[PDB]
Design a protein around this ligand. Sequence first.
Ligand SMILES: [Zn+2]
Ligand SMILES: [Zn+2]
Ligand SMILES: [Zn+2]
Ligand SMILES: [Zn+2]
Ligand SMILES: [Zn+2]
Ligand SMILES: [Zn+2]
Ligand SMILES: [Zn+2]
Ligand SMILES: [Zn+2]
Length: 378
Amino acid sequence: YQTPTGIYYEVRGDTIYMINVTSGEETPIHLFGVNWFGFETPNHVVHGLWKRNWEDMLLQIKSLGFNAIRLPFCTESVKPGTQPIGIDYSKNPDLRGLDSLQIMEKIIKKAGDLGIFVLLDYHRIGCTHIEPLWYTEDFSEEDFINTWIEVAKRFGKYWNVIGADLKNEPHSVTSPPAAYTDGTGATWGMGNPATDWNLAAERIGKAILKVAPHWLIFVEGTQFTNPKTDSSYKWGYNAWWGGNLMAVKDYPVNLPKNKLVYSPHVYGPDVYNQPYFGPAKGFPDNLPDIWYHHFGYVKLELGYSVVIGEFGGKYGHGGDPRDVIWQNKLVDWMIENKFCDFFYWSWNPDSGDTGGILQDDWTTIWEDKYNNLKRLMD
Ligand SMILES: [Zn+2]
Ligand SMILES: [Zn+2]
Ligand SMILES: [Zn+2]
Ligand SMILES: [Zn+2]
Ligand SMILES: [Zn+2]
Ligand SMILES: [Zn+2]
Ligand SMILES: [Zn+2]
Ligand SMILES: [Zn+2]
């Protein structure tokens, strides 16, 4: 167990372990997580620091029973010198004069004092859009990897950083079948290095494990994988961005079994009006089998650690009424099948189709939404 902190994380079966290498103590951990976003935006800092103090926010997250944060970032936020925008330095006087990296470091050190796990998520290459692929004509794979290497060297020193969510939401920007071969979108198992996320995750993960051997590597799904795989299931074309893990069975990512975590995204009627959200398609009793095929079998049949990295919705608040039913159904199903490690989207209220756990006052929570979610925390 090599580690620069004394702590080494690893997967055993479908369970995540935290190992203290000096003393030999080791425990399984849950991830009861939330996303707290903003470092992937042009403000270059988690949102909500106009109305709240950053440390009060971490304390509140903890008081609600969460023990983990997924922290989205974009390339510019993790380069030295990038200035954060929108902080009220009267509520946050200890942030005055800090750059976004210093703020990230301060927040992660504090989460660690509070016993909060951090998962780092390279959410966008620019700070405006999630790209479909892990590069761009102006930012190469080599650049993407070098950024993760400099993130891993800097943040690998914080004991509570559990690892790297390689690239948020690989997806497509045209329909199949062109999306499989037109080079504009992520694929999986096409046998084409320009677009295959399964092969990229191997290359990117290996590079990170060289400098942070103690980290977990979280790999999301794609949107479309390969014609064979997607056409083999009736809703095979209707998986979310980062939400199609159908190609794992035939094309497993070839990263060490004790390091690899699979991390699908899954959403409800508030995010997209999927055909399968018709009561006249089986809703909501049809859901379990759809989740099972899109990603659940990766745990339930193949035995891997599967940590849902995003799910959420308005839960009836200025949104689709079916959302309340959908989050209730999805949480029942995660309980019944022991998907106990997750990250909810999001802590922040300022997410247009999902809202968050906090209300728009950035202070009060959606009680009912939270009470449903809290069933996962036992
Ligand atoms: Zn768990
Ligand atoms: Zn437990
Ligand atoms: Zn900027
Ligand atoms: Zn800029
Ligand atoms: Zn762009
Ligand atoms: Zn089935
Ligand atoms: Zn998302
Ligand atoms: Zn309500």
